[PDB]
Write an enzyme that holds these catalytic residues in place. Structure first.
Site, mmCIF file in Angstrom:
data_model
loop_
_atom_site.group_PDB
_atom_site.id
_atom_site.type_symbol
_atom_site.label_atom_id
_atom_site.label_comp_id
_atom_site.label_asym_id
_atom_site.label_seq_id
_atom_site.Cartn_x
_atom_site.Cartn_y
_atom_site.Cartn_z
ATOM 1 N N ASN E 206 0.805 -1.216 0.000
ATOM 2 C CA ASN E 206 0.000 0.000 0.000
ATOM 3 C C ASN E 206 0.843 1.274 0.000
ATOM 4 O O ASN E 206 0.637 2.150 -0.847
ATOM 5 C CB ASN E 206 -0.950 -0.021 1.197
ATOM 6 C CG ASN E 206 -2.341 -0.486 0.822
ATOM 7 O OD1 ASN E 206 -2.714 -0.477 -0.350
ATOM 8 N ND2 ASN E 206 -3.116 -0.899 1.817
ATOM 9 N N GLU E 254 5.535 -15.756 -22.118
ATOM 10 C CA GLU E 254 6.728 -15.174 -22.729
ATOM 11 C C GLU E 254 7.557 -14.410 -21.708
ATOM 12 O O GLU E 254 8.789 -14.512 -21.703
ATOM 13 C CB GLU E 254 6.333 -14.238 -23.873
ATOM 14 C CG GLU E 254 5.677 -14.870 -25.104
ATOM 15 C CD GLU E 254 6.600 -15.769 -25.891
ATOM 16 O OE1 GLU E 254 7.815 -15.494 -25.911
ATOM 17 O OE2 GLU E 254 6.109 -16.734 -26.513
HETATM 18 N N1 LIG Z 1 -4.693 -1.520 -3.481
HETATM 19 C C1 LIG Z 1 -5.850 -1.578 -2.829
HETATM 20 N N2 LIG Z 1 -5.921 -2.230 -1.617
HETATM 21 C C2 LIG Z 1 -7.093 -2.293 -0.943
HETATM 22 C C3 LIG Z 1 -8.234 -1.708 -1.467
HETATM 23 N N3 LIG Z 1 -9.246 -1.924 -0.600
HETATM 24 C C4 LIG Z 1 -8.775 -2.628 0.452
HETATM 25 N N4 LIG Z 1 -7.442 -2.865 0.253
HETATM 26 C C5 LIG Z 1 -6.543 -3.600 1.157
HETATM 27 O O1 LIG Z 1 -6.762 -4.989 1.007
HETATM 28 C C6 LIG Z 1 -6.832 -5.621 2.267
HETATM 29 C C7 LIG Z 1 -7.793 -6.804 2.219
HETATM 30 O O2 LIG Z 1 -9.128 -6.374 2.085
HETATM 31 P P1 LIG Z 1 -10.171 -6.502 3.303
HETATM 32 O O3 LIG Z 1 -10.390 -5.171 3.977
HETATM 33 O O4 LIG Z 1 -9.690 -7.529 4.296
HETATM 34 O O5 LIG Z 1 -11.518 -7.018 2.592
HETATM 35 P P2 LIG Z 1 -11.650 -8.549 2.120
HETATM 36 O O6 LIG Z 1 -10.448 -8.935 1.302
HETATM 37 O O7 LIG Z 1 -12.934 -8.746 1.356
HETATM 38 O O8 LIG Z 1 -11.648 -9.417 3.478
HETATM 39 P P3 LIG Z 1 -12.781 -9.205 4.603
HETATM 40 O O9 LIG Z 1 -12.536 -7.922 5.362
HETATM 41 O O10 LIG Z 1 -12.805 -10.388 5.542
HETATM 42 O O11 LIG Z 1 -14.106 -9.113 3.894
HETATM 43 C C8 LIG Z 1 -7.251 -4.550 3.256
HETATM 44 O O12 LIG Z 1 -6.556 -4.730 4.465
HETATM 45 C C9 LIG Z 1 -6.850 -3.247 2.603
HETATM 46 O O13 LIG Z 1 -5.700 -2.727 3.228
HETATM 47 C C10 LIG Z 1 -8.173 -1.050 -2.686
HETATM 48 O O14 LIG Z 1 -9.181 -0.527 -3.157
HETATM 49 N N5 LIG Z 1 -6.975 -0.987 -3.367
#
Ligand SMILES: Nc1nc2c(ncn2[C@@H]2O[C@H](COP(=O)(O)OP(=O)(O)OP(=O)(O)O)[C@@H](O)[C@H]2O)c(=O)[nH]1
Ligand SMILES: Nc1nc2c(ncn2[C@@H]2O[C@H](COP(=O)(O)OP(=O)(O)O)[C@@H](O)[C@H]2O)c(=O)[nH]1
Ligand SMILES: Nc1nc2c(ncn2[C@@H]2O[C@H](COP(=O)(O)OP(=O)(O)O)[C@@H](O)[C@H]2O)c(=O)[nH]1
Ligand SMILES: [Mg+2]
Lengths: 183, 132, 90, 237, 439, 429, 429
Positions: E206, E254
């Site tokens: 992130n 590739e």
């Molecule tokens: N790059 C990016 N990362 C994101 C975004 N939204 C969430 N994340 C990250 O991805 C991680 C995983 O997503 P979660 O918040 O756990 O949502 P989930 O994957 O559906 O899992 P649950 O919370 O159990 O539903 C989070 O901790 C965020 O830090 C996004 O829009 N872009």
């Protein structure tokens, strides 16, 4: 560093008889403890290694990570007691293609999985004190079809009762085994 | 570019703003079985930003026997301009003479805005294979 | 009188200063959106064709220099080198 | 409007696309130096077409009873949104069921709406068919009713003065309130976020001289400016 | 024809896929209704959409995507969004109850009741596909469902489709910030599947994207929208080679064969440039050498790691636009002469450059500006060792007291699986050490 | 994903009354049950709390509980009291008499069967039950006793559902009951063994918020109920509305409960601004997080300065950026690492719900498992030991057939919980 | 580059109120807190003294200070009363008793904690604080005692920020208090040891300006505070608006403080004129400089002629040529160089701001570190001795916890400052 030393019959790398038996062993201990204790079963001092995490607590030989062992003996024999805890050991060896490879055995492993550099395999240890053989050449040829040369590193993780670690060139019956080697 | 942007206030750049035209090229076929003079249908993309022309072959019936796809890459043909692009006209590129006879709504709107009234589509010549 | 028993317009657009207008194109967009009152997906992921073509807010009338006229970037133009055409001409 | 191209050409395309002719709306403006005691009640009465002086209690003598504004709508780019504007001008609902707000039915029309956020040198926004009975006010209501019509063609640039646009609560959220831009320097703020519904062609000077200049930075309206009678077509007189 | 199937797991994966699909629609001139306009002709290519969009008999294009999420909020808001007509009613699966930030919950209790239908949807996409290049997974290992159900889908795909390419453009827990507290657990546990059953795994943590948007774009308040727009730009830069005609066309296999030296070593760096706002875009001489240098610099990259702290192994460059091969190799020679970076001894070449002609497309309302050329790097390097060290150090800190382990144990995973995860991460770390060790 | 509510006792009944009032206000539902919301998103997930009828009326999924019918009538005919289903008003003839034993063994036992039937009828009427949220006060008799009985039966019937509870912990500062220590001690062990997650509420802490944070001249129990409802709605805002980073009850319990017995959380909210300073204060996310972590805005009377945060959860609502919902928590961690446990990296979980509470541009609710929570349990245990040493007020409980050893067992369980918090407060790497 | 203001005592509160009136008039700010100026330059740097809220209201970065609450309603009754934040209004139940001892040690100390909290919050609300500013009168208890306590605490907390201060020096001939010598002696050494630069106000030097220059019929404290606000805004005109030759408070201090203990300045404002003379008077840069360097246009009692100028500073405002800002001070440097000491040549800092005050097309403020500043110090010292030699009014101070040795040390530092300002006058190069 055993390249210029005789390697035939037996070669002990750890025994509790010594005043300071971890001369060539480095104890990387985190959230655990490695110390010499006394066993109730054998009424003799052994090496207690514990840690909440099996990976973080271990003893590695040789102590210097840059240095490597030079034992050609293909048999690794351990006298270790199972405490029904999470335990693992690891042997780094050299192949005929002059690139080091690794054989790890753990008691929490599910199935034997081969990897380009490491072969992970499980163990199911019997109750009490156990005496374990390891045919390094046999495992190397079985997993990789690759020739065994010598052993660079021996590593034992937490949750173990070390009594004797020794290399031998062949199967040694309890009759041939020297009295200082038996239990 | 100055007048082309002045006459189109909503426009900002000419990128991805080609003119879609429809044309056909005809060749004599001597060793065939049903046709003797074949018409192959093409779509013209005339990107104004680059002054670039691209030709893509488009068949009509499912059992055409021809290969759909781009037959001519995007590039600048020699001596081809927006004024030359007109319905009922000839476009000579890569040795092929395309009879430009049809256009698209955006292209027609562009031409009326510019001031030259683009004609209506006339016809597509009927080859012997179409009537089969 | 007592016993123990927001007049404001919450709709865009609101005043954006001279600096705020030039900033809000990309920077401080969340700060400068007064009342969007909707989710993020509906706010951002919208019909892209309807929005102005160039990123952010253009300064004024469309700059001709924005468009690219050089044919060299074209796929067929890099397929066929320039000195092949030079060979044609010679 | 649209003519399909030749089907045997091998591709599906539009040969002829004729933009719809630009349409016409008109509104009549009454300006009051003071505000009525109950602006919502005054708006409802003016919508019901009662006498202006009796309807606006406390607003005082109107400074100008008749200020006619003529709006040409850019129907070539705003089918649905400018259709909504026309329906609101004519007081015609686009849905069969009747909209009820705060336990009283409301008719969709500008006949009672008043300019409620006039920011000088920025814009004058009004046209809440709710009559702003609640303190905050709402933009949700439109000709269709409890529907936010999607935005269309935000490409028109806001250089000219007198441009009328649905003041949104965000993208794809257009209701009844419209704002007339009152200066030529706010293209930066107004571009890319509001849809240019139409432009005023008659009454620009009057709107610039008697309604636009008053107000403040937040938009609180100093003068009570109300749409007394609205419709389509050319303005009377 | 050279098509790939996109699969988005978790909330992060779904949002990343939303950004990627709006970018793809903008690239191919496909309206949110799902069909190209008849009035307009973008003319990008005759069949560029074929890789990502399937054609119907009515002239409408449907993405080859699968939005698999265990909770209904994100899927339902996608359904109610603008792209309702573009996205299929199917291929957009929603789960009844969330995985609740638990790898065990998403892999052992809720995973199996949805993986069957997820694989059914994948099969209904694959049989439609005729020359399927592979699968592009989009998820975050730190999340419950995105870790557990992602892992489940990955090894089911591996056992079903055999040796098809699998590219997981996955978001990892960040070195300093982190949304969750069991996030180290989820990442360390999902590293199993991302090791054995993933051909290429792409670091998208992130803070790198965050700070990149912070100074390169100069946005005081950027968010997941901007982060996902950048991620989608990276995805489009990578896939443009198989989409459009290019000077050096490179397919998924590739470049993954040139990117992966050893079976366990597929976690790779990520860096895209030029990223620039509209204000600063029209003022710099955006040259190929300049953009290559900006990519190579430790600052401008999409994953938070320091290449200087590690050893470069193999970098795959994806140039797009009016890029010239002489400019490309001049930049390559300059960066090789530069001693700040260093390649591993056993990989002298270490470079895989591929050029495509179509420049990045404008996303109106976004933060990228119109650029005639761009380049994205996917670099396998030993620098991942330090970030993995931080991850399993956090894992050890959490696992020493057996905190949060009851949540995973009660959801059907054995206590020894955590030891498995720690062992696997240690083995991977010392594998990186071995491959970085001089001969 | 829908959650069903239960209110126990007079305190719990008014807590639920105001909770349903604020929920209906935010979802645009008048007391008649009809919908007049200002957004389409209100009806997207209104089924979490409200069940539609044949006529379109929205009935809260609330089960009401007390032996005294007076507060039952009060909640029935309150300003929003016409929403609740009439058959969910289960009341007895004789009150609990402020007795844990009477509410848990003799009078509440003969009435708990009907309440179990009612909550079942409300449970299988739900498509996919997330769980229960019960609201009560441990100080009272029926709020503590039969509420704990019901949560125990709910654990027996529905093991995996989230059993959220809001327990109002009595305090000596605002004490108006001499058997508050008895009821609290008898109820904490039941809460420990029969609740996925418990949220402790302190009347004195709410009172301090009312005087200092809100500058209210004459705070009222209604004001306390409003303050509690502001976070009762904010805990499931993510369940009800979309957001960039959404969460749910288990999604936050898994991040706030490192160990099974450490499910007692301290309650914070933000923003809370006085009437005169509402137009002067700039609502920015930095101010939100500063006021959230501030001890005075904490409606738990456990000073965070005397403990170490096991875990924290910040449910932010509104249009805000991930920059300042993540970096702010990281900054707090960095400059208060002494107050944050080392062996739990990044103690703070963050969730984002885009739809904000009505009238506020942005807000945030705080759920903290800080180790300082054990001091209120310490003081109530000290009061209980002082009263129980000479066996005072014991005969009222023992005449209801309840054994004498159970008081000692409750003491032992409370002390075990306190030491359990201590050991992880002073636990090192 | 922000300046956070603090007004202490009745005199300080009224002066700060009038200063905020003047600043809001310059920046086009209504009492309700809205911007309606006709120029963008006001909004360009309106953040120096104001902070924007969520609703766009500009709240001054001001702190209100008094032990007597009877003035904190007068300040809010002022024309810009509601402009300030309500929380910054921090007062006490009882007044300072016109006593430095209880304004500094007993009553002010128990109140200074909230003062420091408010000051810290407002200072960190700023992006990069140029510094603090304080307005007070040394003759009283609240302004002198607790004002100097705040000065000491703010030097404890933020040493690098510039600490601007406006202290009103009492005079015997305009005296209305018998403990003025005591308070002034106890506060002047505090200012010496804690104030970055401390120019002085005499009510007499305001009254004579009103009666002679402005020819006012009934000068009032409002007019006095207007004259003070003149320079209070002129000193930061360069910070708030662009100019041909910029300066700030720190630049002024660097140029006008030759030695750390010599930081007491003398002021004046131009143009100032009455009704009749205004039409006859011709505005010019030469007229402005001659008026500002004239003796009768000074807001400190002592005559410039008696002392010698260690350094001078002229901050001009308006569209003017640099020819006459250089050449006019060249004239005044050469024509009566007896004002200026020899070892420091080119004694006059010059600064130009392009934006003059609204309603005036040309103005200038003067800040001078002359050696005549010690004359009223000598007068107040003599009045201090006349009372201290007989222990007059000393029981009031000694009963509040302080001791006579503070009075002795205040006398010692007082005479030290007097000697420093005396003998550098006649020091030979
Ligand atoms: N790059 C990016 N990362 C994101 C975004 N939204 C969430 N994340 C990250 O991805 C991680 C995983 O997503 P979660 O918040 O756990 O949502 P989930 O994957 O559906 O899992 P649950 O919370 O159990 O539903 C989070 O901790 C965020 O830090 C996004 O829009 N872009
Ligand atoms: N916050 C809050 N606390 C309340 C309310 N009503 C009662 N209480 C608290 O609850 C305690 C008494 O609980 P009680 O009504 O006897 O509970 P019951 O016997 O189970 O019905 C008192 O100490 C009050 O402080 C309320 O509306 N809000
Ligand atoms: N210029 C000016 N002087 C004032 C004002 N108010 C009081 N003073 C002077 O201050 C002296 C009294 O100080 P005081 O206000 O009691 O100080 P405090 O006790 O700190 O509030 C009197 O001699 C007045 O001459 C004012 O508004 N303007
Ligand atoms: Mg999720």
């Amino acid at each position: 560093m055993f390249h210029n030393s005789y390697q035939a019959g037996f070669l002990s790398i750890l025994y509790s008889i010594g005043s300071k038996p971890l001369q060539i062993w480095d104890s990387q201990v985190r959230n655990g403890h490695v110390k010499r204790v006394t066993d109730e079963d054998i009424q003799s001092s052994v090496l207690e290694i514990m840690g909440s995490n099996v990976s973080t607590c271990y003893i590695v030989c040789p102590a210097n990570p840059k240095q490597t062992l030079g034992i050609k003996l293909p048999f690794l024999v351990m006298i270790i007691k199972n405490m029904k805890k999470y335990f693992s050991f690891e042997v780094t060896i050299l192949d005929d293609k002059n690139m080091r490879r690794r054989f790890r055995a753990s008691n929490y492993q599910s199935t034997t999985k081969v990897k380009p550099f490491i072969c992970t395999m499980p163990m199911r240890l019997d109750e009490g004190w156990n005496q374990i053989q390891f045919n390094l050449s046999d495992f190397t040829r079985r997993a990789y079809g690759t020739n065994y040369v010598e052993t660079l590193r021996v590593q034992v993780h937490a949750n173990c009762r070390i009594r004797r670690l020794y290399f031998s060139d062949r199967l040694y019956a309890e009759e041939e085994l020297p009295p200082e080697f038996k239990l | 570019v100055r007048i082309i942007l002045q006459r189109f206030p909503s426009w900002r750049t000419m990128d991805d703003k080609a003119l879609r035209f429809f044309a056909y090229y005809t060749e004599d076929v001597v060793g065939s079985r049903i046709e003797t003079w074949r018409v192959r249908k093409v779509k013209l993309h005339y990107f104004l930003a680059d002054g670039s022309l691209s030709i893509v072959e488009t068949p009509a019936v499912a059992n055409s026997g021809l290969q759909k796809g781009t037959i001519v890459s995007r590039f600048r043909p020699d001596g081809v301009d927006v004024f030359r692009l007109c319905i009922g006209a000839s476009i000579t590129c890569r040795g092929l003479e395309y009879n430009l006879v049809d256009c698209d709504a955006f292209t027609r709107e562009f031409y009326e805005v510019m001031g030259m009234p683009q004609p209506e589509p006339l016809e597509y010549p009927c080859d012997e294979f179409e009537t089969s | 009188s007592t016993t123990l028993r927001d007049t404001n317009d919450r709709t865009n657009p609101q005043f954006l200063s001279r600096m705020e207008q030039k900033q809000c194109s990309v920077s401080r967009r969340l700060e400068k959106e007064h009342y969007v009152t909707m989710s993020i997906y509906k706010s951002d992921f919208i019909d892209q064709g309807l929005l102005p073509e160039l990123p952010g807010n253009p300064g004024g009338p469309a700059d001709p220099h924005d468009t690219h006229t050089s044919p060299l970037a074209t796929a067929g133009e890099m397929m066929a080198g320039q000195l092949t055409n030079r060979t044609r001409e010679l | 409007t649209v003519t399909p191209g030749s089907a045997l050409s091998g591709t599906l395309y539009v040969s002829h696309n004729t933009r719809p002719a630009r349409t016409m709306c008109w509104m009549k403006l009454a300006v009051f130096t003071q505000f009525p005691v109950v602006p919502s009640l005054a708006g409802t009465h003016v919508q019901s077409r009662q006498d202006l002086l009796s309807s606006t209690a406390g607003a005082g003598t109107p400074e100008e009873t008749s200020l006619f504004l003529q709006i040409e709508l850019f129907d070539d780019e705003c089918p649905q949104l400018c259709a909504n504007f026309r329906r609101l001008c004519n007081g015609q609902s686009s849905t069969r069921q009747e909209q009820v707000y705060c336990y009283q039915g409301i008719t969709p029309s500008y006949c009672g709406t008043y300019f409620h956020k006039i920011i000088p040198s920025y814009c004058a926004q009004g046209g809440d068919i709710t009559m702003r009975v609640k303190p905050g006010g709402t933009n949700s209501y439109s000709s269709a009713g409890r529907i936010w019509l999607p935005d269309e063609f935000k490409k028109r640039r806001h250089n000219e003065i007198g441009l009328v646009s649905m003041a949104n609560n965000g993208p794809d959220s257009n209701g009844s309130q419209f704002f007339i831009t009152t200066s030529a320097a706010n293209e930066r703020a107004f571009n890319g976020r509001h849809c240019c519904i139409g432009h005023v062609v008659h009454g620009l000077d009057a709107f610039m001289a008697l309604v636009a200049p008053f107000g403040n930075i937040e938009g609180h309206p100093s003068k009570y400016v109300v749409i007394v009678d609205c419709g389509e077509g050319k303005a009377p007189t | 024809m050279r098509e790939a199937i996109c699969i988005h797991i978790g909330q992060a994966g779904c949002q990343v896929g939303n950004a990627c699909w709006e970018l793809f629609c903008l690239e191919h001139g496909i309206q949110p209704d799902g069909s190209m306009p008849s009035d307009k002709c973008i003319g990008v290519e005759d069949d560029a959409f074929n890789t990502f969009f399937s054609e119907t008999g009515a002239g409408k294009h449907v993405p080859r995507c699968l939005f698999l999420d265990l909770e209904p909020t994100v899927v339902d808001e996608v359904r109610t969004g603008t792209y309702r007509q573009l996205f299929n009613p199917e291929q957009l699966v929603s789960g009844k109850e969330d995985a609740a930030n638990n790898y065990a919950r998403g892999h052992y209790t809720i995973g199996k009741e949805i993986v069957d239908l997820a694989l059914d949807r994948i099969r209904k996409l694959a049989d439609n596909c005729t020359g399927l290049q592979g699968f592009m997974v989009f998820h975050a290992v730190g999340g419950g469902t995105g870790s557990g159900l992602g892992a489940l889908l990955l090894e089911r795909l591996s056992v079903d489709y055999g040796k098809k390419s699998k590219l997981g453009y996955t978001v990892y827990p960040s070195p300093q910030v982190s949304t969750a507290v069991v996030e180290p657990y989820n990442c360390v546990l999902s590293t199993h599947s991302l090791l054995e059953h993933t051909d290429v795994a792409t670091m998208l943590d992130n803070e790198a994207i965050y700070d990149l948007t912070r100074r390169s774009l100069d946005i005081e308040r950027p968010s997941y929208t901007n982060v996902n727009r950048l991620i989608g730009q990276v995805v489009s830069s990578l896939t443009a080679s198989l989409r459009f005609d290019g000077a050096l066309n490179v397919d998924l296999t590739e470049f993954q064969t040139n990117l992966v030296p050893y079976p366990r070593i597929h976690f790779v760096l990520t860096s895209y440039a030029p990223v620039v706002s509209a204000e600063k875009a029209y003022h710099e001489q955006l040259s190929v050498a300049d953009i290559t240098n900006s990519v190579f610099e430790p600052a401008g990259m999409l994953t938070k790691c320091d290449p200087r702290h590690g050893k470069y192994m193999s970098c795959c460059l994806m140039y797009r636009g009016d890029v010239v091969p002489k400019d490309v190799n001049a930049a390559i020679a300059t960066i090789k002469t530069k001693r700040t970076i260093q390649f591993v001894d056993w990989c002298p070449t270490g470079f895989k450059c591929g050029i495509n002609y179509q420049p990045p497309t404008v996303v109106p309302g976004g933060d990228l500006a119109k650029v005639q050329r761009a380049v994205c790097m996917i670099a396998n390097s030993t620098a991942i060792a330090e970030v993995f060290a931080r991850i399993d150090h956090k894992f050890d800190l959490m696992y020493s007291k057996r905190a949060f382990v009851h949540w995973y144990v009660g959801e059907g995973m054995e206590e020894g699986e955590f030891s498995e995860a720690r062992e696997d991460l240690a083995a991977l770390e010392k594998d990186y050490e071995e491959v970085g060790a001089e001969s | 994903r829908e959650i069903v509510s239960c209110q126990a006792g007079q305190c719990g009944n008014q807590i639920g009354s105001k909770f349903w009032e604020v929920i209906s206000d935010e979802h645009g539902v008048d007391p008649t049950g009809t919908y007049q919301g200002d957004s389409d998103l209100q009806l997207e997930r209104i089924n979490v709390y409200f069940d539609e009828s044949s006529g379109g009326r929205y009935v809260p999924r609330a089960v009401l509980m007390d032996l005294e019918p007076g507060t039952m009538d009060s909640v029935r005919a309150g300003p929003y009291g016409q929403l609740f289903r009439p058959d969910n008003f289960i009341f007895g003839q004789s009150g609990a008499g402020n007795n844990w034993a009477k509410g848990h063994y003799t009078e509440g036992a003969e009435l708990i069967d009907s309440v179990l039937d009612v909550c079942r009828k409300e449970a299988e009427s739900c498509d996919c039950l997330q769980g229960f949220q019960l609201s009560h006060s441990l100080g009272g008799g029926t709020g503590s006793g039969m509420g704990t009985l019901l949560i125990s039966k709910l654990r027996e019937e529905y093991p995996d559902r989230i059993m959220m509870t809001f327990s109002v912990i009595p305090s000596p500062r605002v004490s108006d009951t001499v058997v508050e220590p008895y009821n609290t001690t008898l109820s904490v062990h039941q809460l420990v063994e029969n609740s996925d997650e418990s949220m402790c509420i302190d009347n004195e802490a709410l009172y301090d918020i009312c005087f200092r944070t809100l500058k209210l001249t004459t705070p009222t129990f209604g004001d306390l109920n409003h303050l509690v409802a502001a976070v009762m709605s904010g805990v499931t805002c993510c369940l009800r509305f979309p957001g960039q980073l959404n969460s749910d009850l288990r999604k936050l319990a898994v991040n706030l409960v490192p160990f099974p017995r450490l499910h007692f959380f301290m309650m914070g909210f933000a923003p809370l601004t006085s009437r005169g300073s509402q137009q002067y204060r700039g609502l920015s996310v930095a101010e939100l997080t500063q006021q959230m972590f501030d001890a005075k805005n904490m409606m738990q009377a456990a000073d965070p300065r005397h403990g170490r945060y096991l875990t924290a959860s910040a449910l932010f609502r509104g249009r805000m950026s991930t920059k300042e919902v993540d970096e702010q928590m990281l900054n707090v961690q960095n400059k208060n690492s002494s107050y944050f446990i080392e062996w739990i990296p990044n103690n703070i979980k963050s969730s984002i719900c885009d739809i904000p509470p009505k009238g506020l541009k942005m807000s945030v609710t705080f759920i903290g498992n800080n180790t300082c929570i054990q001091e209120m349990f310490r003081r109530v245990g000290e009061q209980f030991t002082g009263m129980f040493r000479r066996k005072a007020f014991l005969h009222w409980y023992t005449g209801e057939g309840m054994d004498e050893m159970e008081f000692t067992e409750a003491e032992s369980n409370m002390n075990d919980l306190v030491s359990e918090y201590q050991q992880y407060q002073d636990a090192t790497v």
